[PDB]
């Protein structure tokens, strides 16, 4: 099960960025899928999550400004980040968000998220 994540990079404070996870449709169309993020000095955090029929929850630190979707092909998770703050520096990881089980038993390369001057 691949789990590949893009879409990070450098931005300053009040930037934006667009997060993809690219997953076989077996796994996003059937799961609740969310996005994590790890910083430094910090352990790992749900901050989104979408379920298998579309319903979507934020971690309250980012309500108003990071959006969950998926394409249509199911193929596809975003994660869309806008209004970033330092706060938000993290390697940012896609993976199932199961209420009951949690993620899969593995984790991807992640993608890299800065927000500095
Ligand atoms: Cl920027
Ligand atoms: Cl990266």
């Known amino acids: 099960v691949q789990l590949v994540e893009s879409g990070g990079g450098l931005v300053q404070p009040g930037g934006s960025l667009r997060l993809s996870c690219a997953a076989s449709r077996s796994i996003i169309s059937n799961n609740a899928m969310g996005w994590y993020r790890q910083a430094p000095g910090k352990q790992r955090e749900l901050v989104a999550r979408?379920?298998?029929?579309?319903?979507?929850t934020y971690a309250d630190s980012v309500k108003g400004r990071f959006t969950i979707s998926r394409d249509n092909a199911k193929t596809t998770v975003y994660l869309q980040m806008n209004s970033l703050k330092p706060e938000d520096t993290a390697v940012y990881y896609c993976?199932?968000?199961?209420?009951?089980?949690?993620?899969?038993?593995?984790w991807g390369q992640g993608t890299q998220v800065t927000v500095s001057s």
């Open positions: 979408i379920s298998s029929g579309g319903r979507t």
């Open positions: 993976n199932a968000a199961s209420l009951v089980r949690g993620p899969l038993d593995h």
